[PDB]
Amino acid sequence: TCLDPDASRSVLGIILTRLYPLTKKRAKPAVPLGANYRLIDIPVSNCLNSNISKIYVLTQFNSASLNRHLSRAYASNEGFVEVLAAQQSPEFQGTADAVRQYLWLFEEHTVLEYLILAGDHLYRMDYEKFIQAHRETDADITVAALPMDEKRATAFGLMKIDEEGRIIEFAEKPQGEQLQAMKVDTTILGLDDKRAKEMPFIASMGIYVISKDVMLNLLRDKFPGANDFGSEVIPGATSLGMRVQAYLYDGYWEDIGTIEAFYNANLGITKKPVPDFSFYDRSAPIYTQPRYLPPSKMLDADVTDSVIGEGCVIKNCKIHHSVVGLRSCISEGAIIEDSLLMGADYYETDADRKLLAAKGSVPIGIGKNCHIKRAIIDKNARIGDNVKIINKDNVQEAARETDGYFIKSGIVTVIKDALIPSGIII
Amino acid sequence: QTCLDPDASRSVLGIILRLYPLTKKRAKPAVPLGANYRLIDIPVSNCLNSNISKIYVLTQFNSASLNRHLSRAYAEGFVEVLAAQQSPENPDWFQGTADAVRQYLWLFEEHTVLEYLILAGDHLYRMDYEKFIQAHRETDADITVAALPMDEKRATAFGLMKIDEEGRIIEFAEKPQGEQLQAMKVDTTILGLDDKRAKEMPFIASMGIYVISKDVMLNLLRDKFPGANDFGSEVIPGATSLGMRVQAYLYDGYWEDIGTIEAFYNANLGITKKPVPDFSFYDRSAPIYTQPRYLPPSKMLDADVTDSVIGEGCVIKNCKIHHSVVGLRSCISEGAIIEDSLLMGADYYETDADRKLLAAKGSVPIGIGKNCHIKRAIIDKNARIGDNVKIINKDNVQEAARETDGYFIKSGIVTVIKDALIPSGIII
Amino acid sequence: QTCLDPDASRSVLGIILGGTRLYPLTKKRAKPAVPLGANYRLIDIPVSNCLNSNISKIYVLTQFNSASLNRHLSRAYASEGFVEVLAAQQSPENPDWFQGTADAVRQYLWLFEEHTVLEYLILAGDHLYRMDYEKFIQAHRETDADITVAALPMDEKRATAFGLMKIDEEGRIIEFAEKPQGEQLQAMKVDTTILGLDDKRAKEMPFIASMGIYVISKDVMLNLLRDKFPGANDFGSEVIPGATSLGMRVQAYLYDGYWEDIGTIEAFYNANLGITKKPVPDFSFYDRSAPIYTQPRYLPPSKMLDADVTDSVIGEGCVIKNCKIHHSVVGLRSCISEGAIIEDSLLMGADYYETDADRKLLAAKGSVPIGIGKNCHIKRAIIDKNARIGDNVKIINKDNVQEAARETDGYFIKSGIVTVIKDALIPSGIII
Amino acid sequence: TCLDPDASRSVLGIILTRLYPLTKKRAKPAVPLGANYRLIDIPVSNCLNSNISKIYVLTQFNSASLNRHLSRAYNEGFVEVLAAQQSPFQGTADAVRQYLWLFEEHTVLEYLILAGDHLYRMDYEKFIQAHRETDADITVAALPMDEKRATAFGLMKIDEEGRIIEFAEKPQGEQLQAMKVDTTILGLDDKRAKEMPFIASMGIYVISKDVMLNLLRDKFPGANDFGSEVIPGATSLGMRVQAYLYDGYWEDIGTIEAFYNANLGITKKPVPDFSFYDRSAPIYTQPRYLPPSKMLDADVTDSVIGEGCVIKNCKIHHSVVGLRSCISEGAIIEDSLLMGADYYETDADRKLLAAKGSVPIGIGKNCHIKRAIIDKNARIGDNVKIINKDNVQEAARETDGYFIKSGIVTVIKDALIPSGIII
């Protein structure tokens, strides 16, 4: 394991509506995660921990907030972390189109490979072993691959490789007879019969190492009309007989690109005796903006199976199987269950409270005697007293933006900065 | 409207100048404070928030960890430690505040600045030194002394000052009493204080905080009083006696001494105050800084926590935490009961790779063990407390030095020393 | 004695407007990236003036992104503040531009609104000058202006080429006139002493021009670009006189010091050669308190084998043989071979060095290495980055041609000034 | 092959008056070098380019100046100064022992010891890699040498594994001859090995952490020097002391004459013997944002010009002109090292001085400087002639602002050399 030239100067990292309404009024890479983070911290941290310092973040539109976070957490710390926006304002586009739109600029860098990191996932990876496999196999394109169960199988592009890991057959989210014809022996990649039997597939993780020249050729010369890397470029590449290599990844990897997946993965960090995924790691930790928030205060909290973010201010309440984000105010008598509180971007001066109260408005936080269950409370929500978010009738889907929320997969998501009046029941 | 010219950044040099056993295995400025901080973070942060970036820290001896903290938490400025002793093998000490400054005057002189900001001692407080220094320049003072108004009862314990009508200081009295205390009464109204409080507190004590012009410093330490060991009681009253302009400047706000085990214990537990702590480390524009550690959100299995603060990255099982401060990286085991205590936390996390190695020897892991009961205690960094330990001090001993046993009792408070091992079943 | 409060860094957002008149220096690079004064780039001027004025949240508006521009900005500055590039078009394959200074700001006004600031400091155009925006912002606050406009005094001869302003007796602007002449001009005389000019100068310079330097309150900007003049394309000729016409408080602020536009080849050319100035540089990039910054490069001291150098300036890391260098500016990493004679020229230098393995192979293929070749004679020229000038090349323009578009041959003459294009190869023996 | 643990987290770099008066009023590590640098920049830049970020600098006393240079010119790493004197070293081993307690506080595998002052570029990683791959206790950089020069150094003898088995300080005759080794074993080609059959230590060592405490505290609690006492002692005690071939430019600059010659060595064509700039491993220094150098009428031959010089009509031959150097009308500079200045004097400043009869910073009008080192901020009056016609080799003229050593005149930093003076 020893890249040469090191990744620092020869690899350009490129990070690329199912999360509605967390993306209603913010850039998607900025969506808060794990109490003290944002989605963008996963790929940016993995790069930095893998000695990759040249990072472009492709996104739909610029955001002062996103920039502030990137600037304060990384940019001010040879490298760079720059945002490239697709349009000039916030009023769809494929993975291949996103990269093609800026190819002209990526080509301006003197690098050997492009490390393409698409989609939103929870995982820690040392991209150096990825880049190394790519260079040792003289690959044109290398795809990180994960052992998949027949279950989730058709939701990912699947592949078959030779004893070298060279991809010989790629089949996008196949089904029926082809979903069966792709099934391969997952022992050759180390796994054992037991689980080689439960996960009989090699699935693309949607991240790739692609040789500089190969990229230009593929996106502009060979497949100028392709929109997706997964379903068009990769397949295209293989049919042209290019060297498409597979790199077996064997750690935790969760898609959090949908409300329910996001929800589940966030609450998974509360698991014992070890979280599913650990943001902290002595060697490769996930970073974020340093904030100097004070230690969390708890007046009288019975907390079970939960994690508490930075600088929370909690009264007498009950918190169960939840994630409480930074700067969360939880008032007297609240009960928090199986929920993700994203917290707040600032504190209200208390004096501020006794003022909003006079006006009959509600302050940031979970109001008194609230009952929040199976929910996502986005940043700065103002939940009035006696609000009950329980969705008794187990409604699966409901678009209620006007009332401050949106239900997806039965999970109620209160919108950023929304006010849920006192007494409301959802 | 009111700005320093030249700005503080380039024209002011900051100079930062008992608590045993917290000081037994570390340099005093590195002592952990309020869950996520260290003592040295207070003056350094006040300086940085006040646009002062050239800072020296004078202490008995340095350490790689103090340096780490300082360099990592803070990095045309610098934060450099200057010591009295260069190696533990050749013990040496400063004789006082003026003595320490004098020993490195030759280095402070190499800096092109207009004034030295001297901050002596350990106190919990927030202050914006810019208005202080601006006052110094506007009054053409040689030395400006921050003055803390107090009542007659508190007054006998400090160095008091007597001012004229323009706030200029004309006399000092070190811990005065009786006839001498009375002669020191002053109309605190001259310095601001509302008439009301002015009558409540007709006294003003220096606080170990001063601004001294570069030239003035050399003259005082090298030529006028080459023998003085202390600023507050010798050098400054001495400059006043020589006709130099020593000006008073009113200090207002929280200010609490924490250089004693009991004052330190109380100030730390004070941040759990019900409405709001008397001192808030966090502040929108003048927060207290520390090192970014990227610790994970604290985890709680089944914790019942009352009137307490929890720091960064704690790992707590089922337990009871009442009126306590839980330091960063604290592990608290099944069944523990923590009361009225300060847990400093740990410097790292033991990986299960060590916990098993530790189990192969039936050894005790870092943190609070199962079914321990900890009361009115300070548990220093990385302590290994075994199962069923009860630190309750039922008899109520006030003093006991039991270092070989890992602790020390001062003012009735049990302080378990850093890295100490308190065997299972021990009862204190 | 006084200063902004809130301080500038948290309450002022700088908006630098950058991104054909400087063609071909702009043929293959973002305009803000055009090399300047041997060791700098145009963008360094406004960004430095901002940093030296305690303004740290800076946006750079330009036509298109560039790895070079970004690399220079990252290394030199990005180190709460930021320096970010906002582009008009997201490419070169899908050409897109900005219909003016107001249009550029309007396109990203929604982003600027996301910032919690009191005023926007607008810095437009390519001008060489040093200024402390702090006093400028204070006047804005102390006069409760909605817009404060930096005003440059000048005589009648110079006035017709600028947007002029008329002020009342207290310095409040009440009328504009874009490049007036004859009657419209005469009606623009004012008493500069009103703004601070001494009686002597004021008399010789009875006119004041806008300079593309404005302070605008946050709300005023929103109201102006979106509500009152949603269709205006230019600030100084449309939006600001507009604001005045509406009765907003548009206040003048005197500017006293060096200032040259460097937006045309001739002006850029003359301003660069002006730093070789005999008594003191008209403009000094270096200053005791407000230095012009650039990217640290760790270049080695320049080497001179046998150089007779008069009235010239030499940049970092040059490698020079036996030659004559006169009234010229020699950019970073410049290689000048034996016998070369350089007169009244601007050598932009090079982005890298070529060893000898490189030079050897080049000699073989019969190519030319980077730098000014042997026995060349360069006069009244701008030699862009990495040029390869062959042996015995003569850039003397004997016929005094003023204009000549000759890009296929590596150059472009404009105002009698020959500009060799970035990375161009001028074959040995060529006479221009 | 990458070190693992990598260098940044496992290796601690430790950098340790023959240059008088260049050291009369400045910390030694701060001595100006090659127009734009200072001595300390060589070892520090070599460490940085070798991925070594934890760096200590040992020196007699501290200075704000040196600290300022260190902070500004240079996560988890550091460059810190450890002073032997708290203000107004018996040897390499002494210096290290004095702060052994501090280094011990770091969790590192080895200590990279870089002693002395030399112009040289080395990639310490392969050196460390070797230390590790050979399970060495101490790895010593070896400089190949011929018989003529070897007798003036401390030599080492090795076994066929490259293991050092014996030291000899400046041996002669029979002992010298008994120190011949086969430099081929260390990797030298048969040709060069026969030309240079001897190997000297260079004051560059890699020492395992535990080994250092054991040697300095337990085994030789009273040694002063590593080269002559501790390391030969370590070998005598059977520890694994391994040699590692240093095969590159390496020049001593520890005496006025060698320092002078090395500095002027960078004017040499086609390329200097040593190059400060380098695509991959450049020497770093403080970023000063100084303006391009200005020349009114200068005839410059075989010379190098630093950053921000302000030069009038003059002749500069075979010289090195330091940053911010002001050179007045009619001056003639030859075979000299002008160290420049730490700031510029403006005309407002210049006039006031003249009004006072004082001399401004720089080479005055019609001066003739030859075979001289002009330290920082020197004020040379008009018409001064630093020629030394009687070729005096030594002379201590401090009170007069100068010093002559080896026939080289050295003007002290901030010294005033009144107009008309002839040295």
Contacts of B309 in chain A (CB under 8 A): 294-298
Is residue C20 classed exposed, middle or buried when 0-12, 13-18 and 19+ CB atoms within 10 A define those classes?
exposed
Nearest to A335 by CA among A300, A373, A307, A297: A373
Nearest to D326 by CA among D281, D285, D289, D377: D377
Which residues 53-82 on chain A approach chain D with CB closer than 8 angstroms?
77
Q: Give CA–CA dist A313/A290, Å, rounded.
A: 19
Count of Cβ atoms closer than 10 Å to residue A238 Cβ: 19
Query: What H or E segment, with its residue span, contains residue A67?
Result: helix A64-70
Strand partners, D310: D294, D326
Q: Give CA–CA dist B31/C301, Å, rounded.
A: 48
DSSP assignment letter at C193: G
A292-426: CATH architecture: 3 Solenoid (2.160)
Q: Give CA–CA dist B30/B22, Å, rounded.
A: 10
Q: Give CA–CA dist A314/C176, Å, rounded.
A: 60
The nearest alpha carbon in chain A to D75 belongs to A77
> How far C12 CA lies from chain A's nearest CA (Å)?
14
Q: Give CA–CA dist B65/C217, Å, rounded.
A: 48
HSE toward the beta carbon, residue A42, CA cutoff 13 A: 25
Q: Give CA–CA dist D232/D204, Å, rounded.
A: 14
How big, in percent rounded to 5, are the helix, strand and coil portions of chain C? 25, 30, 45
The highest-level CATH class for domain D1-288 is alpha beta
Q: Give CA–CA dist A132/A137, Å, rounded.
A: 8
Interface test with D, best of C304, C324, C342, C355 (most D CBs within 10 A): C304
A84 reaches C (C-beta below 8 A): yes
Reading the block at residue A4, the tokens are 């040469």
Query: What H or E segment, with its residue span, contains residue C154?
Result: strand C147-154
Interface test with A, best of C51, C75, C90 (most A CBs within 10 A): C90
Q: Give CA–CA dist B231/A145, Å, rounded.
A: 69
**Cβ pair A307, A319 in contact under 8 A:** no
Q: How many residues are present in chain A? A: 426
Angle at D396 (CA atoms; ends D393, D402), nearest 5 degrees: 95
Q: Dihedral of the CA atoms C267, C272, C276, C282 (nearest 10)?
A: 60
Strand partners, C426: C389
CATH superfamily of C1-297: Spore Coat Polysaccharide Biosynthesis Protein SpsA; Chain A (3.90.550.10)
> How far A124 CA lies from chain D's nearest CA (Å)?
20
**DSSP string covering C238-256:** IIHHHHHHTT--EEEEE--
Contacts of C288 in chain D (CB under 8 A): 344
Radius of gyration of chain C (CA): 23
The nearest alpha carbon in chain B to C10 belongs to B285
Q: Looking at the partner chain, which of D62, D68, D78 has a beta carbon nearest the beta carbon of B71?
A: D78
Contacts of C281 in chain D (CB under 8 A): 291, 294
Tell if the CB–CB gap between B296 and A279 is shorter than 8 Å: yes
**Cβ pair B212, B116 in contact under 8 A:** yes
- Hey, which CATH number is domain A1-291, 2.60.40.420, 3.90.550.10, 3.40.640.10, 3.40.190.10? 3.90.550.10
**Cβ pair B249, B144 in contact under 8 A:** yes
Contacts of B300 in chain A (CB under 8 A): 303-308
How big, in percent rounded to 5, are the helix, strand and coil portions of chain A? 25, 30, 45
**Cβ pair A30, A41 in contact under 8 A:** no
Q: What does CATH list as the number for D289-423?
A: 2.160.10.10
> How far C296 CA lies from chain A's nearest CA (Å)?
12
Q: What is the interface size between B and D, counted as CB pairs within 8 Å?
A: 42
Which residues 126-165 on chain A approach chain B with CB closer than 8 angstroms?
none
Q: Which fold, B294-428?
A: UDP N-Acetylglucosamine Acyltransferase; domain 1 (2.160.10)
Query: What H or E segment, with its residue span, contains residue B47?
Result: helix B41-49
Query: Can you point out the beta strands (E) in B85-202?
Result: 115-119, 123-124, 143-150, 159-163, 169-174
Q: Give CA–CA dist B3/A411, Å, rounded.
A: 54
Q: What sections of C54-127 are H helices per DSSP?
A: 67-76, 101-107, 109-113
Tell if the CB–CB gap between A288 and B294 is shorter than 8 Å: yes
Resolution (A): 2.1
Is residue C398 classed exposed, middle or buried when 0-12, 13-18 and 19+ CB atoms within 10 A define those classes?
exposed
Q: Which fold, B1-293?
A: Spore Coat Polysaccharide Biosynthesis Protein SpsA; Chain A (3.90.550)
Is residue B178 classed exposed, middle or buried when 0-12, 13-18 and 19+ CB atoms within 10 A define those classes?
exposed
Query: What H or E segment, with its residue span, contains residue C147?
Result: strand C147-154
Q: Give CA–CA dist D334/C209, Å, rounded.
A: 52
C298-432: CATH architecture: 3 Solenoid (2.160)
The nearest alpha carbon in chain D to C275 belongs to D294
How big, in percent rounded to 5, are the helix, strand and coil portions of chain B? 25, 30, 45
Experimental method: X-ray
Q: At which residue do the structure tokens 């100030």 appear?
A: B267
Interface test with A, best of C59, C65, C73 (most A CBs within 10 A): C65
**Cβ pair A63, C114 in contact under 8 A:** yes
Reading the block at residue D378, the tokens are 């020197």
**Cβ pair D11, D107 in contact under 8 A:** no
Reading the block at residue D298, the tokens are 């200068």
Q: Peptide bond preceding B287: is omega within 30 degrees of 0, i.e. cis? A: no
Residue extents of the structural domains in chain C: 1-297, 298-432
Query: What H or E segment, with its residue span, contains residue C232?
Result: none
